[PDB]
Write a protein that binds this ligand. Structure first.
Ligand SMILES: *[C@@H]1O[C@H](CO)[C@@H](O)[C@H](O)[C@H]1NC(C)=O
Ligand SMILES: [Cl-]
Ligand SMILES: [Cl-]
Ligand SMILES: [Cl-]
Ligand SMILES: [Cl-]
Ligand SMILES: [Cl-]
Ligand SMILES: [Mg+2]
Lengths: 215, 195, 125, 219
């Protein structure tokens, strides 16, 4: 089938900058490449159809280009109402329409250091049988932040899952909550529960740990 | 009255091999495409460059109907930008191809209890076929340094291999009859219109 | 799809004999012909085979250099020239037809053919 | 002024059937090819099906072919999508889209707001709310809404009084099929014994309201 590779996966830019997004196809599409916009929660909205044909009712600052495989979408001067995830969709494969991955445009700001907080499982939860260790990374930028769970200096992967908020409307910062989920028998087998955090705004990796049942 | 003869192309009693694919020229006839819509007996239906819904109200200078037989694992190769034994050595579609590819499982017709070996395919070729090229030459392929003077043997193989179509074949190795409709629009009168 | 052998009989050692094999029916469905022989006490063994297209031939090592296989496409008949007949050549010679097209000519020495003939007797004295 | 309104989405067990419907307005609906497009939670967009303007041609993706069916009623200006034999992969937000027809190929002119379709084999369960006690330059605490289905749950702090500094994270579908959600709030480290913090959790699908006391760990 036809795969649509869209790079970069996510870019950071401020208002007024010449934003350009690249869409590359696995094979040749003449000029049947379309560009859409989707705000968080809202529905998609057509911007460019057929390489570089502007849809009626779309500002003139949006413009497409490219033919064959390497296509481009350019915003001459960025405006505040344009911060959204932009998709590209090929049409040449009529009965097999495929979309790109998307290019979320975030608001560029200064680098913010995350405040890390680690929460042990509540005593009420331990009565049920499950145990949850919550590590909180608060108010950082960009969202590229690695969260590493260590249990008795043993790296942990696959036990947890993360969740990130969108860019904050006040200070334009992200937040992350890693939830380490395991049973009770797996919780008493170990003692040290740590949360290593690596972020661009950290001169060195920061670790927030606690020993089980010591407070 | 002058309906395009899509019936004798799809409902043809017998089909040709993929290396010697048969081409039918469609000209001077009202194109009734309702035989593709109603017939749900199709396994693979993919169009490129044009949409089937907005096709019955559009004229063309000529329509070409190419038909051949391949197996299921090779049906995916009948598309622009594909590579493989069929795409490179038997039937190649250009990168700007504008048409539709139709295929259906013909295991009930193109299979014998002793294996139907009448459908062949080209195995070796010194170069890849150009778009819409039909090569039926049986020249002995030279695979080694020793030149073949038309004789077979050490690194001198016959270029055509026969398909093995049995009723108990896996779905990937069962025969499929493919019909490739291609649409051209030149600076000439359009004789093929839809209705 | 019929196969009819002819030309066999008694022959002195060192002599030469020519075999024929007529094909009738689906005559344009022929991919390759093949000659086989079987002594009574022994099993069937491959002799020679020729591809209908091009005309390339493949011979068994026991007859290579002495036997020559050929075919006339218009008449649809495969011939087998048998020069320098030895006592070990005495067998019933069958001709076989197939529609299987193998890229490798040597496969026709072990491939099970589609139709066979009744066979003709060849005796070397 | 082109409007499309999807409806019919809900929660359904695997293998069951669901019937979606689109409602077109303010354009000649019977003279355009109509599409369905779905989007899984967190994933991207995936085209689904197409029906001709007269309702005579029906085309599908390989992922849903022989499983879904698309139809339309021009007299009622509506677009139908019957979803038979629903699998977990079909959990997505389905949109209807007008074609436009300005090119030889399909593009998407106007989009509806979409309807949510969730396929899961779990019954409606009430959330379990647990506190996140802080410790001893500010501090942070929160509530853990774990093991619930389906979406969503409404979480407020101090009955709506606490607004600034609150973070409610998107839920995550854990392997049990249920949902787990985290909500935290950062307060000054000084006001930790006087000010009372209570998170207000409400799960209307299960009809469960819960208020949990959140006080610091004691030792
Ligand atoms: C081909 O044959 C089928 C029945 O086998 C028939 O339904 C169909 O209409 C035929 N095609 C045409 C173009 O008439
Ligand atoms: Cl969204
Ligand atoms: Cl021509
Ligand atoms: Cl002689
Ligand atoms: Cl209306
Ligand atoms: Cl109508
Ligand atoms: Mg979480």
């Amino acid at each position: 089938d036809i795969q649509m590779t869209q790079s970069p996966s996510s870019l950071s830019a401020s208002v007024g900058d010449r934003v350009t997004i690249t869409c590359r196809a696995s094979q040749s599409i003449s000029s049947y490449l379309n560009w859409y916009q989707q705000k968080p929660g809202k529905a998609p909205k057509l911007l460019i159809y057929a390489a570089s044909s502007l849809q009626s009712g779309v500002p003139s600052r949006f413009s497409g280009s490219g033919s064959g495989t390497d296509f481009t979408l350019t915003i001459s001067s960025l405006q505040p109402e344009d911060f959204a995830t932009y998709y590209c969709q090929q049409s040449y494969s009529t009965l097999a329409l495929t979309f790109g991955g998307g290019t979320k445009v975030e608001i560029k700001r200064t680098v913010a250091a995350p405040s890390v907080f680690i929460f042990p499982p509540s005593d009420e939860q331990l009565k049920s049988g499950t145990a949850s260790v919550v590590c909180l990374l608060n108010n950082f930028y960009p969202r590229e932040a690695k969260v590493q769970w260590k249990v008795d200096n043993a790296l942990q992967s696959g036990n947890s899952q993360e969740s990130v908020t969108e860019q904050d409307s006040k200070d334009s910062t992200y937040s992350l909550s890693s939830t380490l989920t395991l049973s009770k028998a797996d919780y008493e087998k170990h003692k040290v529960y740590a949360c290593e955090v690596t972020h661009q705004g950290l001169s060195s990796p920061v670790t927030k740990s606690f020993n089980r049942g010591e407070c | 009255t002058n309906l395009c003869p899509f019936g004798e192309v799809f409902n043809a009693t017998r089909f040709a091999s993929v290396y010697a694919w048969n081409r039918k020229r469609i000209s001077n006839c009202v194109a009734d495409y309702s035989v593709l819509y109603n017939s749900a007996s199709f396994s693979t239906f993919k169009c490129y460059g044009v949409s089937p819904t907005k096709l019955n109200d559009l004229c063309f200078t000529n329509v070409y109907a190419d038909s051949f037989v391949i197996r299921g694992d090779e049906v995916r190769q009948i598309a622009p930008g594909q590579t493989g034994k069929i795409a490179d050595y038997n039937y190649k579609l250009p990168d700007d191809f504008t048409g539709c590819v139709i295929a259906w499982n013909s295991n009930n017709l193109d299979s014998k209890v002793g294996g139907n070996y009448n459908y062949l395919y080209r195995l070796f070729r010194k170069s890849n076929l150009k778009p819409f090229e039909r090569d039926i030459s049986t020249e002995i392929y030279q695979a080694g340094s020793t030149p073949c003077n038309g004789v077979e043997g050490f690194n001198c193989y016959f270029p055509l291999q026969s398909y093995g179509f049995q009723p108990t074949n896996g779905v990937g190795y069962q025969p499929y009859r493919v019909v490739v409709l291609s649409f051209e629009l030149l600076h000439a009168p359009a004789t093929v219109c839809g209705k | 799809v019929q196969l009819v052998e002819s030309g066999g009989g008694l022959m002195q050692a060192g002599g030469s004999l020519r075999l024929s094999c007529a094909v009738s029916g689906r005559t344009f469905s022929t991919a390759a012909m093949g000659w086989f022989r079987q002594a009574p006490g022994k099993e069937r063994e491959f002799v020679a085979a020729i591809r209908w297209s091009g005309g390339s031939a493949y011979y068994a090592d026991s007859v290579k250099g002495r036997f020559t296989i050929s075919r006339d496409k218009a008449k649809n008949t495969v011939y087998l020239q048998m020069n320098s007949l030895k006592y070990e050549d005495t067998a019933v010679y069958y001709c076989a037809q197939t529609h299987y097209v193998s890229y490798l000519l040597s496969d026709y020495a072990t491939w099970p053919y589609d139709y066979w003939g009744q066979g003709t007797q060849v005796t070397v004295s | 002024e082109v409007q499309l309104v999807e409806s019919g989405g809900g929660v359904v067990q695997p293998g069951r059937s669901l019937r979606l419907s689109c409602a077109a307005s303010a354009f000649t609906f019977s003279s355009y090819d109509m599409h369905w497009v779905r989007q899984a939670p967190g994933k991207g967009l995936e085209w689904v099906a197409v029906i001709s303007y007269d309702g005579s041609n029906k085309y599908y993706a390989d992922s849903v072919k022989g499983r879904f069916t698309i139809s339309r009623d021009n007299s009622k200006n509506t677009l139908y999508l019957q979803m038979n034999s629903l699998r977990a992969e079909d959990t997505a937000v389905y949109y209807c889209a007008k074609d436009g027809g300005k090119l030889w190929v399909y593009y998407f002119d106007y989009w509806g707001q979409g309807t949510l379709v969730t396929v899961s084999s779990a019954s409606t369960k009430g959330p379990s709310v647990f506190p996140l006690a802080p410790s001893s330059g500010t501090a942070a605490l929160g509530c853990l809404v774990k093991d619930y289905f389906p979406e969503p749950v409404t979480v407020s702090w101090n009955s709506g009084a606490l607004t600034s500094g609150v973070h409610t994270f998107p839920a995550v579908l854990q392997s049990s099929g249920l949902y787990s959600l985290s909500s935290v709030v950062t307060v000054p480290s000084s006001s930790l014994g006087t000010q009372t913090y209570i998170c207000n959790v409400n799960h209307k699908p299960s009809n469960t309201k819960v208020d949990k006391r959140v006080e610091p760990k004691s030792c």
